[PDB]
Amino acid sequence: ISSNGKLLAHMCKDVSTKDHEHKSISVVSLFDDSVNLSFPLGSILSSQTQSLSYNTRYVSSMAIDNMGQQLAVGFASGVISIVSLADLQIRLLKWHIDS
Amino acid sequence: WTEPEIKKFILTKINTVHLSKIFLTISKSITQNPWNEENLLPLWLKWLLTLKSGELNSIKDKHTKKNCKHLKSALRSSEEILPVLLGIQGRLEMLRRQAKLRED
Amino acid sequence: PKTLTFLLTHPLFPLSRTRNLLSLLRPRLFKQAIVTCPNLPLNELLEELFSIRNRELLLDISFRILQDFTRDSIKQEMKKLSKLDVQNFIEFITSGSTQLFQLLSLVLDSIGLFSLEGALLENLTLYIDKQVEIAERNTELWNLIDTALPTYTMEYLDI
Amino acid sequence: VKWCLIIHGGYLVSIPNLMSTLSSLHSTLKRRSDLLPRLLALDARLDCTINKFKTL
Amino acid sequence: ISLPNFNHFSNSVSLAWSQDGSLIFHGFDDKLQILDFDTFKKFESLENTKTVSEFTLDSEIQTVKLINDTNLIVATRTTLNAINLLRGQVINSFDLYPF
Amino acid sequence: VAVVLELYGNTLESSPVLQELMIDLKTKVRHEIHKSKEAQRIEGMLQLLT
RNA sequence: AUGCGAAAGCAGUUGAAGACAAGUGCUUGUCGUUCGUUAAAAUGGCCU
């Protein structure tokens, strides 16, 4: 839940059922119906990580901006990725060596 | 099999070609008699271990490792037995010197 | 009797049978009483050890007394004991294990500095020296158990 | 110290508290005798490697 | 010091001390020894009124206590035994082996 | 030195300087074993002389 | 790696089902899946 409490963002497995791209990120507004987005983690992640481990492909924490522009995912390998939700694109923040 | 150098030679030939079964019979013989005065068979095991440890690790899983754990138990008991034997040797040396002092 | 073997299995055995039942027991009940009896006097036990019965009761009684008693007490009782059987016992050891080696240590402690024969001590030093040597080789063996530039290489392949 | 313990042992067995008298001797021999087994292990592995590179 | 060399190791020991500073009850497995603090040796009675320096208890000792200078409580591996010291005999018993 | 011998046996064979260093190390460790053997003997002598 | 045990050790353990991916109906690997047993990766390191 975003720090205002106006947005939530969760993950799903129905795109694992309906795709090879497995987990779906969906962000939904709460007190109005202004924002609602859904996209696969296959599109979120990099492509050079598919020859690598589930430690890298295991998302471990989510955080949302209070405007909905930025969504930060944190993997179990210790590399944060911040997606801008306009063009749905990533920037990498690499410091942690554990999860 | 008599000379240690020819033992090195025939050991290199055994590892060229048998090593598992001779290790097994050496293991059973030594875990039967740990205090065997014939050092030649311990020289066999010592040279085989200082040459060919990796294949001894990688050959099998049960019918080497069980006897390996048993021989480990026996020889660790020998490592336990050593120090009081050294102390008894020291006391006997003291008594020998006292006897010498009584003589001269 | 089955009741007596059950009482030998039983932990508490009060005072007087533990004091003097070893003379009464002096096979199967002997082995049972020596592997289990809660109180066992040192004089009778050392006399039973220094008897030459030798049913590996060397190992049994030695493990028993080294389990239950103290080095100073064993030293004092074997000081009270006789010298001739001590000589016959150490002759038995040098003719033919940590239990009996600690026994040898304690009989050395009880005998002290006075009663040492010559050739007996020579054979004892020879036996102890060769056994220290074989124990050292044994220890080293146990620790051993616990243990690019192709400048021009003319080869040929099979196509 | 070997010859001393050889010769003068009568007064040594006569004095009661031999530990409190010969304290530092007992402690020094204690350190060294406790040091021994790791040295045996290190020499075993060192001799293994030395004979390994010497055999060829 | 009091350092005997026992070839048997038992994981369960206990001990207790009288209020005067003289009597020490060292309860090793199966056996309680009564010692004088001045000697660290067995308190051998010159009268010998069956106040024996060693007690042998049926189970392994988990606890020794003295509630006063009179009553010694022992909690043994199956049971519990309350003994008096002004007369060397067990007063009370309690079974704890199912518990 | 246990972990150094565990690691570098191949370059130990390849380079000759470390071979001479292992010779000196072998001699000194054997000498130290001799020292501690004599010390254990003298401690046994004391335990007799108690 | 479980139980007993002392800081030793002594016994025993690695079974299936389902699903998916890749490669070629078949092989391996995987599990944010079930039941049965006593059972190394994303060049990324600690303030003033």
Does A have 3 or more CB contacts under 8 Å with E? no
Chain G: nucleotides below 7 Å from protein CB are: 5-11, 20-22, 30-33, 40-45
Contact C116 B95 (CB under 8 A): yes
**Given a contact as 3+ CB pairs under 8 Å, which chains touch B?**
C, D, F
Q: What single-letter amino acid sits at D31?
A: R
What three-state secondary structure class fits A25?
A: strand
The whole-angstrom distance between F11's CA and the closest CA on chain D is 10
Contacts of C109 in chain F (CB under 8 A): 47-48, 50
- Crossing angle of helices C42-50 and C57-68, in 10° steps, is 160
- Three-state SS letters, E28-80: ECCEEEEEECCCCEECCCCCCCCCCCEEECCCCEEEEEECCCCEEEEEECCEE
Which is nearest to F48 in space by CA: B98, D24, B102, B82?
B98
Do B74 and F31 meet the contact criterion of CB atoms below 8 Å apart? no
Give me the residue from E7, E57, E59 closest to C66, CB to CB. Answer: E7
Q: Is the CB of residue A31 inside 7 Å of nucleic acid strand G?
A: no
Contacts across the B-C interface (CB distance below 8 Å): 86
- Interface residue ranges in chain E relative to chain C, Cβ cutoff 8 Å: 4-8, 30, 56-59
Distance CA E68 to C1' G2 in A: 44
Q: Nearest 5°: CA angle at E64, between E62 and E68?
A: 155
Q: Which nucleotide lies at the shortest CA–C1' distance from B80?
A: G8
Instruction: Check B81 against C97: CB less than 8 A apart.
Output: yes
Which technique? cryo-EM
Which residues of C fall within a CB distance of 8 Å from B84?
98, 101-102, 105
Q: Does D1 touch chain B (CB under 8 A)?
A: no
Write out the two tokens for A50.
């598919």
Neighbouring chains of F at 3+ CB pairs within 8 Å? B, C, D
Report the residue of C70, C106, C109 to disrupt the F interface, i.e. the one with the largest count of F CBs within 10 Å.
C109
To which residue do tokens 């988990």 refer?
E62
Residue C113 to residue D45, Cβ atoms within 8 A? no
**B64 close to B56: Cβ distance less than 8 angstroms:** yes
Instruction: Look up residue C112 and give its two tokens.
Output: 């002290």
Sheet of strand A89-94: strand arrangement: A59-64, A70-75, A79-84, A89-94
Contacts of C159 (CB under 8 A, 6+ apart): none
A23 CA from G18 C1′ (Å): 20
Q: Which residues of B touch F (CB under 8 A)?
A: 83, 86-91, 93-94
A72, containing H or E segment: strand A70-75
Quote the tokens at residue F15: 């380079």
Gap sites in chain B (C to N > 2.5 Å), preceding residue numbers: 17
